[PDB]
Protein backbone atom coordinates (compact mmCIF):
# COMPACT_ATOMS: atom_id res chain seq x y z
CA UNK A 1 0.00 0.00 0.00
CA UNK A 2 1.38 3.35 -1.09
CA UNK A 3 2.02 6.28 1.25
CA UNK A 4 0.65 9.72 0.33
CA UNK A 5 1.69 12.59 2.59
CA UNK A 6 -1.59 14.41 3.30
CA UNK A 7 -0.18 16.73 5.97
CA UNK A 8 -0.56 20.52 5.83
CA UNK A 9 3.23 20.81 5.50
CA UNK A 10 6.29 18.56 5.37
CA UNK A 11 9.71 19.37 6.80
CA UNK A 12 11.70 17.55 4.09
CA UNK A 13 14.84 17.12 6.24
CA UNK A 14 15.15 14.79 9.24
CA UNK A 15 17.69 16.05 11.76
CA UNK A 16 17.61 12.99 14.00
CA UNK A 17 19.08 11.88 17.31
CA UNK A 18 19.60 8.30 18.47
CA UNK A 19 21.98 6.03 20.37
CA UNK A 20 24.34 3.26 19.28
CA UNK A 21 24.66 0.01 21.20
CA UNK A 22 28.46 0.14 20.88
CA UNK A 23 30.18 3.43 20.17
CA UNK A 24 33.94 3.78 19.84
CA UNK A 25 34.70 4.07 23.54
CA UNK A 26 38.02 5.85 24.18
CA UNK A 27 39.91 4.52 27.19
CA UNK A 28 37.62 4.17 30.19
CA UNK A 29 34.62 6.11 28.84
CA UNK A 30 32.66 2.85 28.52
CA UNK A 31 32.80 2.40 32.32
CA UNK A 32 29.54 3.88 33.70
CA UNK A 33 31.40 5.50 36.60
CA UNK A 34 33.60 7.40 34.13
CA UNK A 35 31.29 7.70 31.13
CA UNK A 36 28.92 10.39 29.97
CA UNK A 37 25.77 11.37 31.81
CA UNK A 38 22.28 10.55 30.53
CA UNK A 39 22.39 13.70 28.37
CA UNK A 40 25.62 12.83 26.53
CA UNK A 41 24.87 9.38 25.11
CA UNK A 42 23.34 10.61 21.84
CA UNK A 43 24.60 10.71 18.28
CA UNK A 44 23.09 12.82 15.51
CA UNK A 45 22.51 12.61 11.78
CA UNK A 46 20.85 14.47 8.93
CA UNK A 47 18.81 12.79 6.19
CA UNK A 48 17.27 14.59 3.22
CA UNK A 49 14.10 13.81 1.27
CA UNK A 50 15.73 11.45 -1.25
CA UNK A 51 13.05 9.15 -2.75
CA UNK A 52 10.52 11.25 -0.84
CA UNK A 53 11.43 9.18 2.22
CA UNK A 54 11.19 11.91 4.87
CA UNK A 55 7.74 13.16 3.85
CA UNK A 56 6.66 9.55 3.40
CA UNK A 57 8.03 8.69 6.84
CA UNK A 58 6.08 11.53 8.48
CA UNK A 59 2.89 10.27 6.82
CA UNK A 60 3.67 6.67 7.79
CA UNK A 61 4.13 7.58 11.46
CA UNK A 62 0.83 9.48 11.26
CA UNK A 63 -0.99 6.52 9.71
CA UNK A 64 0.60 4.06 12.17
CA UNK A 65 -0.94 5.78 15.20
CA UNK A 66 -4.41 4.20 15.07
CA UNK A 67 -3.13 0.62 14.91
CA UNK A 68 -0.41 1.38 17.46
CA UNK A 69 -2.86 2.98 19.91
CA UNK A 70 -5.27 0.06 19.54
CA UNK A 71 -2.38 -2.33 20.20
CA UNK A 72 -1.34 -0.45 23.35
CA UNK A 73 -4.95 -0.41 24.58
CA UNK A 74 -5.11 -4.21 24.40
CA UNK A 75 -1.76 -4.99 26.09
CA UNK A 76 -1.32 -5.20 29.85
CA UNK A 77 2.39 -4.33 29.68
CA UNK A 78 3.10 -0.88 31.08
CA UNK A 79 6.04 -0.38 28.68
CA UNK A 80 6.18 -2.17 25.32
CA UNK A 81 9.67 -2.99 24.00
CA UNK A 82 8.86 -6.05 21.87
CA UNK A 83 7.16 -4.73 18.72
CA UNK A 84 10.28 -5.03 16.55
CA UNK A 85 11.43 -8.44 17.82
CA UNK A 86 7.82 -9.51 17.24
CA UNK A 87 8.00 -8.38 13.61
CA UNK A 88 11.22 -10.37 13.19
CA UNK A 89 9.59 -13.54 14.52
CA UNK A 90 6.50 -13.11 12.34
CA UNK A 91 8.85 -12.45 9.42
CA UNK A 92 10.51 -15.84 9.93
CA UNK A 93 7.23 -17.63 10.70
CA UNK A 94 5.59 -16.45 7.48
CA UNK A 95 8.40 -18.00 5.41
CA UNK A 96 9.61 -20.95 7.49
CA UNK A 97 6.63 -21.72 9.73
CA UNK A 98 5.61 -24.58 7.45
CA UNK A 99 7.09 -27.02 4.96
CA UNK A 100 9.01 -25.23 2.20
CA UNK A 101 7.76 -26.58 -1.13
CA UNK A 102 10.56 -25.86 -3.61
CA UNK A 103 9.49 -23.60 -6.51
CA UNK A 104 6.25 -22.68 -4.72
CA UNK A 105 5.59 -18.96 -4.35
CA UNK A 106 5.83 -18.98 -0.54
CA UNK A 107 9.12 -20.93 -0.34
CA UNK A 108 12.23 -18.73 -0.40
CA UNK A 109 14.61 -21.41 -1.70
CA UNK A 110 16.47 -20.78 -4.95
CA UNK A 111 17.51 -24.19 -6.37
CA UNK A 112 18.93 -22.88 -9.67
CA UNK A 113 22.57 -23.77 -8.97
CA UNK A 114 21.49 -27.19 -7.71
CA UNK A 115 19.49 -27.93 -10.86
CA UNK A 116 22.25 -26.96 -13.29
CA UNK A 117 24.87 -28.75 -11.19
CA UNK A 118 22.67 -31.84 -11.54
CA UNK A 119 21.81 -31.07 -15.17
CA UNK A 120 25.43 -30.79 -16.31
CA UNK A 121 26.24 -34.00 -14.39
CA UNK A 122 24.63 -35.91 -17.28
CA UNK A 123 26.92 -34.18 -19.79
CA UNK A 124 29.49 -36.99 -19.64
CA UNK A 125 27.56 -38.70 -22.43
CA UNK B 1 0.56 -37.26 24.73
CA UNK B 2 -3.20 -37.55 25.00
CA UNK B 3 -5.37 -35.44 27.31
CA UNK B 4 -7.90 -37.17 29.57
CA UNK B 5 -10.21 -34.90 31.54
CA UNK B 6 -10.07 -36.31 35.08
CA UNK B 7 -11.98 -33.45 36.72
CA UNK B 8 -15.06 -34.00 38.90
CA UNK B 9 -17.13 -32.10 36.31
CA UNK B 10 -16.66 -30.31 32.99
CA UNK B 11 -18.53 -27.23 31.84
CA UNK B 12 -18.61 -28.19 28.13
CA UNK B 13 -19.12 -24.60 26.89
CA UNK B 14 -16.49 -21.85 27.00
CA UNK B 15 -18.05 -18.40 27.25
CA UNK B 16 -14.83 -16.44 26.84
CA UNK B 17 -13.69 -12.83 26.97
CA UNK B 18 -10.58 -11.38 25.33
CA UNK B 19 -9.24 -8.33 23.50
CA UNK B 20 -8.26 -7.71 19.89
CA UNK B 21 -5.14 -5.77 18.96
CA UNK B 22 -7.08 -3.85 16.29
CA UNK B 23 -10.85 -3.63 16.48
CA UNK B 24 -12.95 -1.75 13.95
CA UNK B 25 -12.57 1.69 15.49
CA UNK B 26 -15.42 4.02 14.51
CA UNK B 27 -14.37 7.64 14.07
CA UNK B 28 -12.23 8.79 17.00
CA UNK B 29 -12.86 5.85 19.34
CA UNK B 30 -9.28 4.65 18.80
CA UNK B 31 -7.97 7.84 20.43
CA UNK B 32 -7.36 7.02 24.12
CA UNK B 33 -8.82 10.36 25.21
CA UNK B 34 -12.10 9.50 23.44
CA UNK B 35 -12.08 5.70 23.62
CA UNK B 36 -13.59 3.24 26.04
CA UNK B 37 -12.49 2.87 29.63
CA UNK B 38 -10.53 -0.13 30.90
CA UNK B 39 -13.83 -2.01 31.38
CA UNK B 40 -15.05 -1.60 27.79
CA UNK B 41 -12.16 -3.00 25.75
CA UNK B 42 -13.36 -6.61 25.75
CA UNK B 43 -14.97 -8.80 23.12
CA UNK B 44 -16.80 -12.05 23.82
CA UNK B 45 -17.34 -15.41 22.18
CA UNK B 46 -18.92 -18.79 22.81
CA UNK B 47 -17.28 -22.11 21.91
CA UNK B 48 -18.88 -25.52 22.36
CA UNK B 49 -17.28 -28.90 23.09
CA UNK B 50 -16.69 -29.88 19.45
CA UNK B 51 -13.91 -32.51 19.29
CA UNK B 52 -14.03 -32.52 23.09
CA UNK B 53 -11.88 -29.39 22.96
CA UNK B 54 -13.39 -27.53 25.92
CA UNK B 55 -13.14 -30.42 28.39
CA UNK B 56 -9.70 -31.20 26.99
CA UNK B 57 -8.69 -27.55 27.38
CA UNK B 58 -9.77 -27.50 31.04
CA UNK B 59 -7.68 -30.61 31.68
CA UNK B 60 -4.72 -29.17 29.76
CA UNK B 61 -4.74 -25.97 31.82
CA UNK B 62 -4.89 -28.14 34.95
CA UNK B 63 -1.95 -30.28 33.83
CA UNK B 64 0.05 -27.22 32.72
CA UNK B 65 0.10 -25.73 36.23
CA UNK B 66 3.00 -27.74 37.68
CA UNK B 67 5.41 -26.94 34.85
CA UNK B 68 4.19 -23.33 34.73
CA UNK B 69 4.60 -22.84 38.48
CA UNK B 70 8.09 -24.37 38.39
CA UNK B 71 8.97 -22.02 35.53
CA UNK B 72 7.72 -18.97 37.43
CA UNK B 73 9.67 -20.04 40.53
CA UNK B 74 12.92 -20.06 38.54
CA UNK B 75 12.49 -16.72 36.74
CA UNK B 76 13.46 -13.38 38.26
CA UNK B 77 10.98 -11.44 36.12
CA UNK B 78 8.10 -10.08 38.17
CA UNK B 79 5.70 -10.37 35.21
CA UNK B 80 6.26 -12.93 32.44
CA UNK B 81 5.01 -11.95 28.97
CA UNK B 82 7.42 -13.98 26.81
CA UNK B 83 6.24 -17.60 27.03
CA UNK B 84 4.50 -17.56 23.65
CA UNK B 85 7.20 -15.67 21.73
CA UNK B 86 9.61 -18.15 23.32
CA UNK B 87 7.61 -21.08 21.92
CA UNK B 88 7.71 -19.45 18.47
CA UNK B 89 11.50 -19.13 18.60
CA UNK B 90 11.97 -22.71 19.80
CA UNK B 91 9.56 -23.78 17.04
CA UNK B 92 11.82 -22.21 14.41
CA UNK B 93 15.04 -23.36 16.08
CA UNK B 94 13.94 -27.01 16.16
CA UNK B 95 13.42 -26.99 12.37
CA UNK B 96 15.92 -24.43 11.07
CA UNK B 97 18.54 -24.27 13.84
CA UNK B 98 20.82 -26.55 11.85
CA UNK B 99 21.56 -27.59 8.29
CA UNK B 100 18.43 -28.84 6.50
CA UNK B 101 19.27 -32.20 4.93
CA UNK B 102 16.72 -32.65 2.13
CA UNK B 103 14.52 -35.76 2.55
CA UNK B 104 15.70 -36.21 6.15
CA UNK B 105 12.94 -36.51 8.74
CA UNK B 106 13.86 -33.26 10.54
CA UNK B 107 14.06 -31.10 7.38
CA UNK B 108 10.76 -29.48 6.39
CA UNK B 109 11.60 -29.01 2.72
CA UNK B 110 9.35 -30.63 0.11
CA UNK B 111 11.40 -31.00 -3.12
CA UNK B 112 8.76 -32.94 -5.09
CA UNK B 113 8.03 -30.23 -7.66
CA UNK B 114 11.77 -29.62 -8.09
CA UNK B 115 12.48 -33.31 -8.74
CA UNK B 116 9.74 -33.75 -11.35
CA UNK B 117 10.63 -30.43 -12.99
CA UNK B 118 14.16 -31.80 -13.29
CA UNK B 119 12.94 -35.30 -14.18
CA UNK B 120 10.75 -34.16 -17.07
CA UNK B 121 13.61 -31.95 -18.32
CA UNK B 122 15.20 -35.12 -19.72
CA UNK B 123 12.02 -35.95 -21.65
CA UNK B 124 13.27 -34.19 -24.79
CA UNK B 125 14.87 -37.48 -25.82
CA UNK C 1 38.46 -14.64 17.51
CA UNK C 2 40.50 -16.58 20.04
CA UNK C 3 40.31 -16.06 23.81
CA UNK C 4 43.54 -15.58 25.77
CA UNK C 5 43.19 -15.43 29.55
CA UNK C 6 45.26 -12.38 30.53
CA UNK C 7 44.13 -12.31 34.17
CA UNK C 8 46.60 -12.27 37.09
CA UNK C 9 45.25 -15.68 38.16
CA UNK C 10 42.63 -18.22 37.07
CA UNK C 11 40.57 -20.42 39.36
CA UNK C 12 40.44 -23.43 37.01
CA UNK C 13 37.30 -24.94 38.60
CA UNK C 14 33.79 -23.49 38.32
CA UNK C 15 31.64 -24.39 41.32
CA UNK C 16 28.40 -22.97 39.96
CA UNK C 17 24.84 -22.42 41.14
CA UNK C 18 21.76 -22.05 38.96
CA UNK C 19 18.07 -22.94 38.71
CA UNK C 20 16.14 -25.36 36.52
CA UNK C 21 12.82 -24.43 34.94
CA UNK C 22 11.37 -27.84 35.89
CA UNK C 23 12.96 -29.86 38.66
CA UNK C 24 11.66 -33.24 39.77
CA UNK C 25 8.97 -31.96 42.11
CA UNK C 26 8.04 -34.54 44.76
CA UNK C 27 4.38 -34.49 45.73
CA UNK C 28 3.19 -30.94 46.38
CA UNK C 29 6.59 -29.22 46.48
CA UNK C 30 5.83 -27.54 43.14
CA UNK C 31 2.94 -25.64 44.77
CA UNK C 32 4.35 -22.23 45.82
CA UNK C 33 2.46 -22.37 49.13
CA UNK C 34 4.23 -25.65 49.99
CA UNK C 35 7.49 -25.28 48.07
CA UNK C 36 10.91 -24.03 49.05
CA UNK C 37 11.67 -20.45 49.96
CA UNK C 38 13.66 -18.12 47.71
CA UNK C 39 16.88 -19.52 49.20
CA UNK C 40 16.15 -23.18 48.40
CA UNK C 41 15.47 -23.09 44.65
CA UNK C 42 19.09 -23.58 43.57
CA UNK C 43 20.99 -26.53 42.15
CA UNK C 44 24.77 -26.82 42.05
CA UNK C 45 27.44 -28.28 39.80
CA UNK C 46 31.20 -28.48 39.41
CA UNK C 47 33.02 -28.09 36.10
CA UNK C 48 36.77 -28.45 35.62
CA UNK C 49 39.10 -26.73 33.14
CA UNK C 50 38.70 -29.31 30.35
CA UNK C 51 39.62 -27.69 27.00
CA UNK C 52 40.69 -24.66 29.03
CA UNK C 53 37.01 -23.71 29.16
CA UNK C 54 36.90 -22.26 32.68
CA UNK C 55 39.89 -19.94 32.26
CA UNK C 56 38.61 -19.05 28.80
CA UNK C 57 35.16 -18.36 30.24
CA UNK C 58 36.58 -16.01 32.88
CA UNK C 59 38.43 -14.10 30.16
CA UNK C 60 35.35 -14.05 27.92
CA UNK C 61 33.18 -12.56 30.68
CA UNK C 62 35.91 -9.97 31.25
CA UNK C 63 36.09 -9.07 27.56
CA UNK C 64 32.29 -8.99 27.24
CA UNK C 65 31.92 -6.19 29.79
CA UNK C 66 32.69 -3.22 27.53
CA UNK C 67 30.15 -4.19 24.86
CA UNK C 68 27.62 -5.20 27.52
CA UNK C 69 28.00 -1.93 29.43
CA UNK C 70 27.68 0.10 26.22
CA UNK C 71 24.53 -1.87 25.38
CA UNK C 72 23.01 -1.21 28.81
CA UNK C 73 23.85 2.50 28.52
CA UNK C 74 21.85 2.75 25.29
CA UNK C 75 18.73 0.85 26.40
CA UNK C 76 15.85 2.46 28.28
CA UNK C 77 14.78 -0.83 29.89
CA UNK C 78 15.49 -0.89 33.61
CA UNK C 79 16.05 -4.67 33.56
CA UNK C 80 17.23 -6.46 30.40
CA UNK C 81 16.06 -10.07 29.97
CA UNK C 82 16.11 -10.33 26.17
CA UNK C 83 19.78 -10.62 25.17
CA UNK C 84 19.65 -14.39 24.63
CA UNK C 85 16.31 -14.50 22.81
CA UNK C 86 17.73 -11.68 20.69
CA UNK C 87 20.76 -13.81 19.79
CA UNK C 88 18.42 -16.65 18.80
CA UNK C 89 16.44 -14.38 16.47
CA UNK C 90 19.59 -12.93 14.88
CA UNK C 91 20.86 -16.50 14.54
CA UNK C 92 17.81 -17.44 12.48
CA UNK C 93 17.75 -14.15 10.55
CA UNK C 94 21.37 -14.52 9.42
CA UNK C 95 20.59 -17.91 7.83
CA UNK C 96 16.93 -17.67 6.81
CA UNK C 97 16.33 -13.92 6.55
CA UNK C 98 16.69 -14.10 2.77
CA UNK C 99 16.30 -16.52 -0.10
CA UNK C 100 18.32 -19.70 0.44
CA UNK C 101 20.37 -20.31 -2.71
CA UNK C 102 21.18 -24.03 -2.65
CA UNK C 103 24.94 -24.78 -2.58
CA UNK C 104 25.73 -21.14 -1.77
CA UNK C 105 27.94 -20.60 1.28
CA UNK C 106 25.23 -18.79 3.29
CA UNK C 107 22.47 -21.37 2.67
CA UNK C 108 22.35 -24.17 5.25
CA UNK C 109 20.60 -26.72 3.03
CA UNK C 110 22.31 -30.04 2.36
CA UNK C 111 20.83 -31.47 -0.88
CA UNK C 112 23.17 -34.49 -1.14
CA UNK C 113 20.52 -37.16 -0.54
CA UNK C 114 18.18 -35.39 -2.97
CA UNK C 115 20.81 -35.30 -5.72
CA UNK C 116 21.75 -38.98 -5.45
CA UNK C 117 18.10 -40.00 -5.14
CA UNK C 118 17.56 -38.14 -8.42
CA UNK C 119 20.86 -39.36 -9.89
CA UNK C 120 20.13 -43.04 -9.29
CA UNK C 121 16.61 -42.54 -10.70
CA UNK C 122 18.21 -42.59 -14.18
CA UNK C 123 19.85 -45.95 -13.45
CA UNK C 124 16.96 -47.89 -14.99
CA UNK C 125 18.75 -47.62 -18.34
C1 LIG D 1 -2.64 12.49 11.07
O1 LIG D 1 -2.77 13.57 10.13
C2 LIG D 1 -4.09 14.10 10.02
C3 LIG D 1 -4.04 15.16 8.94
O2 LIG D 1 -3.10 16.18 9.26
C4 LIG D 1 -4.55 14.65 11.36
O3 LIG D 1 -5.89 15.10 11.24
C5 LIG D 1 -6.40 16.09 12.04
O4 LIG D 1 -7.39 15.42 12.84
C6 LIG D 1 -7.92 16.21 13.92
C7 LIG D 1 -8.90 15.32 14.66
O5 LIG D 1 -8.24 14.56 15.67
C8 LIG D 1 -8.57 17.48 13.36
O6 LIG D 1 -9.01 18.29 14.45
C9 LIG D 1 -10.24 18.85 14.21
O7 LIG D 1 -10.16 20.03 13.40
C10 LIG D 1 -11.45 20.61 13.12
C11 LIG D 1 -11.25 21.75 12.13
O8 LIG D 1 -9.87 22.07 12.06
C12 LIG D 1 -9.60 23.15 11.25
O9 LIG D 1 -8.40 23.78 11.62
C13 LIG D 1 -7.21 23.02 11.37
C14 LIG D 1 -6.04 23.80 11.94
O10 LIG D 1 -5.65 24.78 10.98
C15 LIG D 1 -7.09 22.76 9.86
O11 LIG D 1 -5.94 21.99 9.61
C16 LIG D 1 -8.34 22.01 9.37
O12 LIG D 1 -8.26 21.79 7.97
C17 LIG D 1 -8.77 20.73 7.27
O13 LIG D 1 -9.97 20.06 7.59
C18 LIG D 1 -11.19 20.76 7.23
C19 LIG D 1 -12.35 19.92 7.70
O14 LIG D 1 -12.55 20.18 9.09
C20 LIG D 1 -11.18 20.99 5.71
O15 LIG D 1 -12.35 21.70 5.34
C21 LIG D 1 -9.94 21.81 5.32
O16 LIG D 1 -9.94 22.06 3.92
C22 LIG D 1 -8.67 21.09 5.77
O17 LIG D 1 -8.59 19.91 4.97
C23 LIG D 1 -9.63 22.75 9.76
O18 LIG D 1 -9.69 23.91 8.91
C24 LIG D 1 -12.06 21.07 14.45
O19 LIG D 1 -13.31 21.67 14.22
C25 LIG D 1 -12.23 19.85 15.36
O20 LIG D 1 -12.83 20.23 16.60
C26 LIG D 1 -13.97 19.56 16.99
O21 LIG D 1 -13.87 18.17 17.19
C27 LIG D 1 -12.97 17.75 18.24
C28 LIG D 1 -13.00 16.24 18.27
O22 LIG D 1 -12.10 15.78 17.28
C29 LIG D 1 -13.40 18.40 19.57
O23 LIG D 1 -12.47 18.07 20.58
C30 LIG D 1 -13.45 19.92 19.40
O24 LIG D 1 -13.83 20.54 20.63
C31 LIG D 1 -14.39 20.30 18.26
O25 LIG D 1 -15.69 19.89 18.69
C32 LIG D 1 -10.90 19.12 15.57
O26 LIG D 1 -10.09 19.96 16.38
C33 LIG D 1 -7.59 18.24 12.49
O27 LIG D 1 -8.21 19.37 11.88
C34 LIG D 1 -7.02 17.33 11.41
N1 LIG D 1 -6.05 18.04 10.59
C35 LIG D 1 -6.07 18.02 9.26
C36 LIG D 1 -5.00 18.81 8.57
O28 LIG D 1 -6.92 17.39 8.63
C37 LIG D 1 -4.44 13.58 12.43
O29 LIG D 1 -4.74 14.11 13.72
C38 LIG D 1 -3.04 12.98 12.46
N2 LIG D 1 -2.97 11.91 13.44
C39 LIG D 1 -2.20 11.97 14.53
C40 LIG D 1 -2.25 10.78 15.44
O30 LIG D 1 -1.48 12.94 14.77
C1 LIG E 1 -5.91 -30.46 38.79
O1 LIG E 1 -7.01 -31.36 38.95
C2 LIG E 1 -6.89 -32.25 40.07
C3 LIG E 1 -8.10 -33.16 40.04
O2 LIG E 1 -9.31 -32.42 40.10
C4 LIG E 1 -6.80 -31.45 41.36
O3 LIG E 1 -6.59 -32.34 42.45
C5 LIG E 1 -6.98 -32.04 43.73
O4 LIG E 1 -5.75 -31.92 44.45
C6 LIG E 1 -5.89 -31.40 45.78
C7 LIG E 1 -4.50 -31.30 46.36
O5 LIG E 1 -3.89 -30.06 46.03
C8 LIG E 1 -6.82 -32.30 46.60
O6 LIG E 1 -7.02 -31.71 47.88
C9 LIG E 1 -7.00 -32.64 48.89
O7 LIG E 1 -8.24 -33.32 49.04
C10 LIG E 1 -8.23 -34.33 50.07
C11 LIG E 1 -9.54 -35.09 50.03
O8 LIG E 1 -10.47 -34.37 49.22
C12 LIG E 1 -11.72 -34.93 49.19
O9 LIG E 1 -12.71 -33.98 48.90
C13 LIG E 1 -12.67 -33.45 47.56
C14 LIG E 1 -13.72 -32.36 47.47
O10 LIG E 1 -14.98 -32.97 47.23
C15 LIG E 1 -12.91 -34.60 46.58
O11 LIG E 1 -12.85 -34.10 45.26
C16 LIG E 1 -11.83 -35.67 46.77
O12 LIG E 1 -12.05 -36.76 45.88
C17 LIG E 1 -11.10 -37.57 45.31
O13 LIG E 1 -9.90 -37.96 45.94
C18 LIG E 1 -10.03 -38.99 46.94
C19 LIG E 1 -8.65 -39.22 47.53
O14 LIG E 1 -8.42 -38.22 48.52
C20 LIG E 1 -10.63 -40.24 46.28
O15 LIG E 1 -10.79 -41.25 47.25
C21 LIG E 1 -11.99 -39.89 45.67
O16 LIG E 1 -12.58 -41.04 45.08
C22 LIG E 1 -11.84 -38.75 44.66
O17 LIG E 1 -11.09 -39.29 43.57
C23 LIG E 1 -11.76 -36.14 48.24
O18 LIG E 1 -12.94 -36.94 48.45
C24 LIG E 1 -7.98 -33.62 51.41
O19 LIG E 1 -7.98 -34.57 52.46
C25 LIG E 1 -6.63 -32.91 51.36
O20 LIG E 1 -6.35 -32.26 52.60
C26 LIG E 1 -5.16 -32.56 53.22
O21 LIG E 1 -3.97 -32.27 52.53
C27 LIG E 1 -3.75 -30.87 52.24
C28 LIG E 1 -2.45 -30.77 51.48
O22 LIG E 1 -2.73 -31.04 50.11
C29 LIG E 1 -3.75 -30.07 53.55
O23 LIG E 1 -3.63 -28.69 53.27
C30 LIG E 1 -5.07 -30.32 54.30
O24 LIG E 1 -5.09 -29.57 55.51
C31 LIG E 1 -5.26 -31.81 54.55
O25 LIG E 1 -4.20 -32.19 55.43
C32 LIG E 1 -6.56 -31.93 50.18
O26 LIG E 1 -7.44 -30.85 50.49
C33 LIG E 1 -8.15 -32.48 45.89
O27 LIG E 1 -8.98 -33.40 46.59
C34 LIG E 1 -7.92 -32.99 44.47
N1 LIG E 1 -9.18 -33.13 43.76
C35 LIG E 1 -9.51 -34.24 43.08
C36 LIG E 1 -10.85 -34.22 42.41
O28 LIG E 1 -8.75 -35.20 43.00
C37 LIG E 1 -5.64 -30.45 41.28
O29 LIG E 1 -5.63 -29.61 42.43
C38 LIG E 1 -5.77 -29.59 40.03
N2 LIG E 1 -4.64 -28.69 39.92
C39 LIG E 1 -4.76 -27.36 39.99
C40 LIG E 1 -3.48 -26.58 39.87
O30 LIG E 1 -5.84 -26.81 40.14
C1 LIG F 1 39.37 -7.30 32.70
O1 LIG F 1 40.68 -7.75 33.05
C2 LIG F 1 41.68 -6.71 33.08
C3 LIG F 1 42.99 -7.38 33.41
O2 LIG F 1 42.93 -8.07 34.65
C4 LIG F 1 41.29 -5.65 34.11
O3 LIG F 1 42.24 -4.59 34.05
C5 LIG F 1 42.51 -3.79 35.14
O4 LIG F 1 42.03 -2.50 34.74
C6 LIG F 1 42.00 -1.53 35.80
C7 LIG F 1 41.43 -0.26 35.20
O5 LIG F 1 40.01 -0.24 35.27
C8 LIG F 1 43.41 -1.34 36.37
O6 LIG F 1 43.33 -0.45 37.48
C9 LIG F 1 44.38 0.44 37.49
O7 LIG F 1 45.57 -0.11 38.05
C10 LIG F 1 46.69 0.79 38.05
C11 LIG F 1 47.93 0.04 38.51
O8 LIG F 1 47.53 -1.19 39.11
C12 LIG F 1 48.57 -1.90 39.64
O9 LIG F 1 48.14 -2.76 40.67
C13 LIG F 1 47.32 -3.86 40.23
C14 LIG F 1 46.85 -4.60 41.47
O10 LIG F 1 47.88 -5.49 41.87
C15 LIG F 1 48.14 -4.74 39.28
O11 LIG F 1 47.34 -5.81 38.82
C16 LIG F 1 48.61 -3.90 38.08
O12 LIG F 1 49.40 -4.69 37.20
C17 LIG F 1 49.49 -4.56 35.83
O13 LIG F 1 49.44 -3.33 35.14
C18 LIG F 1 50.65 -2.53 35.20
C19 LIG F 1 50.37 -1.25 34.45
O14 LIG F 1 49.68 -0.36 35.33
C20 LIG F 1 51.81 -3.34 34.61
O15 LIG F 1 53.00 -2.59 34.69
C21 LIG F 1 51.97 -4.65 35.40
O16 LIG F 1 53.06 -5.40 34.90
C22 LIG F 1 50.67 -5.45 35.39
O17 LIG F 1 50.50 -5.88 34.03
C23 LIG F 1 49.36 -2.64 38.55
O18 LIG F 1 50.64 -3.09 39.03
C24 LIG F 1 46.33 1.98 38.94
O19 LIG F 1 47.41 2.89 38.98
C25 LIG F 1 45.09 2.68 38.37
O20 LIG F 1 44.75 3.81 39.16
C26 LIG F 1 44.62 5.02 38.52
O21 LIG F 1 43.64 5.13 37.52
C27 LIG F 1 42.28 4.94 37.95
C28 LIG F 1 41.40 5.07 36.73
O22 LIG F 1 41.39 3.81 36.07
C29 LIG F 1 41.94 5.97 39.05
O23 LIG F 1 40.64 5.72 39.54
C30 LIG F 1 42.96 5.83 40.19
O24 LIG F 1 42.65 6.76 41.22
C31 LIG F 1 44.38 6.01 39.67
O25 LIG F 1 44.44 7.36 39.20
C32 LIG F 1 43.92 1.71 38.24
O26 LIG F 1 43.48 1.39 39.55
C33 LIG F 1 43.98 -2.68 36.81
O27 LIG F 1 45.33 -2.53 37.25
C34 LIG F 1 43.93 -3.67 35.66
N1 LIG F 1 44.45 -4.97 36.07
C35 LIG F 1 45.35 -5.65 35.36
C36 LIG F 1 45.78 -6.97 35.93
O28 LIG F 1 45.80 -5.22 34.30
C37 LIG F 1 39.90 -5.11 33.80
O29 LIG F 1 39.48 -4.21 34.83
C38 LIG F 1 38.89 -6.25 33.71
N2 LIG F 1 37.58 -5.74 33.35
C39 LIG F 1 36.52 -5.83 34.17
C40 LIG F 1 35.25 -5.23 33.65
O30 LIG F 1 36.60 -6.36 35.27
Numbering used by the authors:
A (entry chain B), B (entry chain B), C (entry chain B): 502 to 626
Text from the published report:
We next combined the W615L mutation and “L” extension in a single construct named GPΔmuc-W615L-L-foldon, or simply GPΔmuc-WL2-foldon. To understand how the HR2 stalk and HR1C mutations affect EBOV GP, we determined crystal structures for the unliganded GPΔmuc-foldon with WL2 and WL2P2 at 2.3 and 3.2 Å, respectively. In the WL2 structure, the glycan cap covers the RBS with glycan moieties visible for N238/N257 in GP1 and N563/N618 in GP2. Indeed, W615L exerted a positive effect on the stalk structure (bottom center and right). As a result, the coiled-coil region in the EBOV HR2 stalk added one more helical turn (D624-V631), thereby resembling the MARV HR2 stalk (right).
EBOV GP contains a heavily glycosylated mucin-like domain (MLD) that shields the glycan cap and neutralizing epitopes in GP1 and GP2. We first examined the contribution of two regions in GP2, namely the stalk and heptad repeat 1-C (HR1C) regions, to GP metastability in a mucin-deleted Zaire EBOV GP construct (GPΔmuc).
